[PDB]
């Protein structure tokens, strides 16, 4: 029945929907197009921040390292970085800005620090994620052209990797806690997965959006008095200038968590 409901939602939406839910209560999954590729857009900021956190495990004062912000760093969406032009921000501050405001300059500084998109991808491989690929920097990584494998992953792979990062042992205890704290403080996700869950549930999530009306969210969820869940909801549309559809992600979240 969950499968029929997701198929009906996809049909009504007019687009292509990818869902992966991991329920850690019983080690089960709910999957819909979960092995297809989707453009990650800003959901890839989780992997970039995690790569910096991993690097910090052998470089204690890494997160305090200062990074210059210049006019030449500005890209298309810079809500935090635009306030710090001609000063510096720490790597911790850049991580928080990327994860909690979806700041694209912040993402680019995390990418650059670790060596570029191929280094973020190599980190994913080291974790056992052989699907994720980060090809480009901001702002071009969210073009989300149908058929283009650049800057894509699958729902299954991203759910499994997010579980490892937030609930598993990819990161040391301090670094895992820091990632979870950052994601729980996200400001951009209230209309996405969160909108399909009861108000009492606790969520750490990262949204993304891009061309072709691409609208994404990945989340770790602590339901009231239950074992945690991991949920990836990816969505993309046929028209280049399609509008956002955060409501589709909320609907998918409601379908897969009902009962």
Author numbering: 29 to 287
Share the article's original sentences.
It is predominantly plasmid mediated, disseminated worldwide, and encountered in diverse Gram-negative pathogens, mostly Enterobacterales, but occasionally also in nonfermenters. CTX-M-15, like other class A SBLs, employs an acylation-deacylation mechanism to hydrolyze β-lactam antibiotics, utilizing four invariant residues: Ser70, Lys73, Ser130, and Glu166. In this study, ultrahigh-resolution X-ray crystal structures and mass spectrometry revealed the mechanism of PAS inhibition of CTX-M-15, an extended-spectrum β-lactamase (ESBL) globally disseminated among Enterobacterales.
To investigate the process of cross-link formation, we obtained structures from cocrystals of enmetazobactam and tazobactam with CTX-M-15E166Q, a conservative mutant in which Glu166 is replaced by an isosteric Gln, such that deacylation of the acylenzyme formed during β-lactam hydrolysis is impaired. Additional diffraction data collected for uncomplexed CTX-M-15E166Q indicate that Asn170 adopts two conformations in the E166Q-substituted active site, with the conformation observed in the native enzyme being the minor conformer (occupancy, 0.28). Gln166 in apo-CTX-M-15E166Q adopts the same orientation as Glu166, with other active-site residues also in equivalent positions. Mutation of Glu166 to Gln does not affect backbone or side chain geometry. The catalytic water (Wat; green or blue sphere) moves 0.8 Å due to the movement of Asn170.
